[PDB]
Amino acid sequence: PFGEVFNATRFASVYAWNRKRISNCVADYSVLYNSASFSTFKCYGVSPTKLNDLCFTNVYADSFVIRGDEVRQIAPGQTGKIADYNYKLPDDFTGCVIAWNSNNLDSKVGGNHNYLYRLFRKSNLKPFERDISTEIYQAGSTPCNGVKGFNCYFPLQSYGFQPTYGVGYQPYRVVVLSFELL
């Protein structure tokens, strides 16, 4: 069922992530581990080599791409500018955090501007809530309709990935599972 999320061709930018449920199927869970192709494999609530219990209703898999040293903001707690304005997973978490390198896939010499991250949001993001709007921020002044002039910031910013960056700045693809029942 998930040779479709861990091997997807074009990944999503973090401010617009693609919540994908998988149900009505026999979930394998044995191809995620016993594979050394992951940089981080951190599963919090339930353990691997035990999750063959009845989570066949609404297993989710949230995928996005973020920079390398921003992988540390996809833990419970761990505030920042990804876990506040882009993707905040809650404190009482049970899924696994999976992240592998994608330097050869998502890097251009001039720079990929298709990937983004939302830098300016009015309030912090709630657990598992997405925002895709493009609204001019109006940080300190009296607000206006939006001309992008002085003190008027564009609410998204690109990464600009490149091949010869540092390992903290190379693009990482993150897939975060989440199990819940009825």
Epitope: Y33, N34, F41, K42, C43, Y44, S47, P48, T49, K50, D69, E70, V71, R72, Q73, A75, P76, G77, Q78, D91, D92, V97, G168
Partner: antibody, heavy 131, light 109 residues
Framework: QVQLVESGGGVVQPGRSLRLSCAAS????????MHWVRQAPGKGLEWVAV????????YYGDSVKGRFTISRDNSKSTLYLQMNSLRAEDTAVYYC????????????????????????WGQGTTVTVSS | VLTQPPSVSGAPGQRVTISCTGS?????????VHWYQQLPGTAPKLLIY???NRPSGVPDRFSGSKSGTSASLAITGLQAEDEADYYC???????????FGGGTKLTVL
């Protein structure tokens, strides 16, 4: 409103013991690892001990190896440190620091050898050893 | 023990870099370097974690970096309140413990 108030200050003699309690409110204490860190007066920072998710993994510092003992209580949300046979060098300000909720595992085995630092910090018990 | 300079100096508006050199088992083993702001008379606060992630609350002047076995930091446009010390933190698998830096008294002229 996250906070960490810790108690157990005073001036003691070399060759006896002490205990350092540390309350915690506002957050889930029963899921986050917890550290103890101390600071000699005017000098740098040093690390002492750590207590795991439930109380299974305990790693101690290079200096307190054999003299200290760390416990915890998830019933009243309170970390404990037992310093046994205090030398004349254990004078510091003892900080009770919140670790990280990290309790990951791959292929089953849980572990506490992390990267993540200490998010919120205590206030400080200033124990003093003297004669 | 991570090698860190004793004091760095900078006039306001300038850019001061607090270096930190560790061993091959401290930072070069592959554990992240964090930085702390300890004002005198106050418990420290985590300035940067995971070598680049600034938490909610620190301004956009503290950059943070890591290169091999020796991390660093940079403060641009430093003002008259940055009188604090700035330690480091990492892990050492040969010691099975958490290490700290030494202290860098940043003074503003």
């Amino acid at each position: 409103q996250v906070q960490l108030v810790e108690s157990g200050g005073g001036v003691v003699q070399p060759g006896r013991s002490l205990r350092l309690s540390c309350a915690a409110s506002g957050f889930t204490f029963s899921s986050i690892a917890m550290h103890w860190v101390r600071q000699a007066p005017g000098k740098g920072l040093e690390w002492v001990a750590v207590m795991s998710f439930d109380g299974s993994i305990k790693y101690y510092g290079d200096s307190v190896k054999g003299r200290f003992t760390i416990s915890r209580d998830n019933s009243k949300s309170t970390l404990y440190l037992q310093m046994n046979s205090l030398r004349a060098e254990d004078t510091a300000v003892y900080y009770c620091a919140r670790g990280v909720q990290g309790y990951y595992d791959r292929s089953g085995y849980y572990n506490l050898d992390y990267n993540y630092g200490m998010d919120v910090w205590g206030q400080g018990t200033t124990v003093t050893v003297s004669s | 023990v991570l090698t860190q300079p004793p004091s760095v100096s900078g006039a306001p508006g300038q850019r001061v870099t607090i270096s930190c050199t560790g061993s091959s088992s401290n930072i070069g083993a592959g554990y992240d370097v964090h930085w702390y702001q300890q004002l005198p008379g106050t418990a420290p606060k985590l300035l940067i974690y995971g070598n680049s992630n600034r938490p909610s609350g620190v301004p956009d002047r503290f950059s943070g970096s890591k290169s091999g076995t020796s991390a660093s930091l940079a403060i641009t446009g430093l003002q008259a309140e940055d009188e604090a010390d700035y330690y480091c933190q990492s892990y050492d698998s040969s010691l099975s413990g958490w290490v700290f830096g030494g202290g860098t008294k940043l003074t503003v002229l």
